[PDB]
Amino acid sequence: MNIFEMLRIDEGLRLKIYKDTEGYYTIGIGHLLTKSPSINAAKSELDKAINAAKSELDKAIGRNTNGVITKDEAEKLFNQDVDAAVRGILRNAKLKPVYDSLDAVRRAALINMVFQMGETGVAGFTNSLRMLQQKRWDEAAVNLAKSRWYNQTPNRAKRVITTFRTGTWDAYK
Q1: Is 7 annotated as a binding residue?
Q2: Exposed (0-12), middle (13-18) or buried (19+): which is 2, by Cβ within 10 Å?
Q3: Is 20 a catalytic residue?
Q4: Quick one: fold of 1-173?
Q5: Alpha-helix residue ranges (DSSP H) falling in the chain
Q6: Which residue among the candidates 10, 20, 56, 81 is catalytic per the annotation?
Q7: What are the domain boundaries of the chain?
Q8: Is 32 a known ligand-binding residue?
């Protein structure tokens, strides 16, 4: 168990563009592309949407991907996607210190959240981060459970939350 496995589990893997849970054009190990649109307003908006997706895709890939990729390709983006997140965290004056305060397993937990909801969003968990940084695991856990993140993605959140609290990988084990 490491951050990779952890998000590989949490994010899934598909080698053909699919409409995710959040309505985004997505591919690989949760590498979003485009934001899928509304209730029947296309074509042409549909077409434009997917194409943009493809384009975004071909961009990241370096080739004419017809919205279909390979494990190797997905996996390449995933690692990138991970890096970017670690980086957000360490540049972010809110996250940075929490991260610095954390341990290996707990770090993966923070990374996960960022990977999933981005630097800014994660950076807003003012109180939870506080607790985190103070090593108030249970308090933190409880608080994190009152979140929108949690309400919207309970299973996953639950998983992420148990890691912070126990400091183990039990919820992935």
Answers
A1: no
A2: exposed
A3: yes
A4: Lysozyme (1.10.530)
A5: 3-11, 45-61, 71-91, 95-101, 104-117, 119-123, 126-134, 137-144, 148-152, 154-166
A6: 20
A7: 1-173
A8: yes
